[PDB]
Amino acid sequence: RIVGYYQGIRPLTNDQAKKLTHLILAFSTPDSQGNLSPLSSVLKQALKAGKSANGALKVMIAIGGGGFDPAIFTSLASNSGTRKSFINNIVSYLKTNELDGCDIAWAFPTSSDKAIFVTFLRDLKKAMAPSGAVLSMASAASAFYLDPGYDLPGIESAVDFINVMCYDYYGSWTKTSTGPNSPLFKGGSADPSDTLNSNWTMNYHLMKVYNRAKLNMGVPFYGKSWTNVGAPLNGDGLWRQLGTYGTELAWRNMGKSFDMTKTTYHKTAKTAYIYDTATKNFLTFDNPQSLKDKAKYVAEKGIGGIMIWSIDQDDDKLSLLNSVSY
Ligand SMILES: CC(=O)N[C@@H]1[C@@H](O)[C@H](O[C@@H]2O[C@H](CO)[C@@H](O[C@@H]3O[C@H](CO)[C@@H](O[C@@H]4O[C@H](CO)[C@@H](O[C@@H]5O[C@H](CO)[C@@H](O)[C@H](O)[C@H]5NC(C)=O)[C@H](O)[C@H]4NC(C)=O)[C@H](O)[C@H]3NC(C)=O)[C@H](O)[C@H]2NC(C)=O)[C@@H](CO)O[C@H]1O
Ligand SMILES: *[C@@H]1O[C@H](CO)[C@@H](O[C@@H]2O[C@H](CO)[C@@H](O)[C@H](O)[C@H]2NC(C)=O)[C@H](O)[C@H]1NC(C)=O
Containing structural domain, residue 112: 2-221+286-325
Residue 106 CA: nearest ligand 1 atom is 51
Q: 125: burial class by Cβ within 10 Å (0-12, 13-18, 19+)?
A: middle
Residue 276 lies in a domain: no
- Ligand 2, atom 5, lies closest to the CA of 200
Residue 262 lies in a domain: no
Residue 187 lies in a domain: yes
Contacts for 277 with CB less than 8 Å, ≥ 6 apart: none
Q: Is the beta carbon of 311 within 6 A of some atom in ligand 1?
A: no
How far, in Å, CA of 296 to CA of 217, rounded? Answer: 12
* DSSP secondary structure code for residue 232 in this structure: B
Residue 168 lies in a domain: yes
Residue 226 lies in a domain: no
CA of 168 to the centre of ligand 1 (A): 6
Pocket (CB within 6 angstroms of ligand 2): 185-186, 199-200, 203
How far, in Å, CA of 280 to CA of 202, rounded? Answer: 33
Residue 203 CA: nearest ligand 2 atom is 4
The domain that holds 319 is classified in CATH as: 3.20.20.80
Q: Nearest bound ligand to CA 137?
A: 1
Closest alpha carbon to 142 in 66, 205, 201, 209: 201
Contacts for 225 with CB less than 8 Å, ≥ 6 apart: 245, 246, 247, 249, 281, 282, 283, 284
Q: To one decimal place, what's the resolution in Å?
A: 1.8
Helices 80-96 & 70-78 angle (0-180, nearest 10) = 110
Residue 207 CA: nearest ligand 2 atom is 20
Instruction: Give SS3 for 222.
Output: strand
Residue 101 lies in a domain: yes
Residue 127 CA, distance from chain mean position: 25
Intra-chain end-to-end CA distance of the chain, in Å: 13
How far, in Å, CA of 317 to CA of 204, rounded? Answer: 35
Residue 229 lies in a domain: no
Q: Is the beta carbon of 67 within 6 A of some atom in ligand 1?
A: yes
Q: Nearest bound ligand to CA 147?
A: 1
Number of folded domains that form the chain: 1
Residue 250 CA: nearest ligand 1 atom is 43
CA of 294 to the centre of ligand 2 (A): 16
Residue 260 lies in a domain: no
CB 219 within 8 A of CB 307: yes
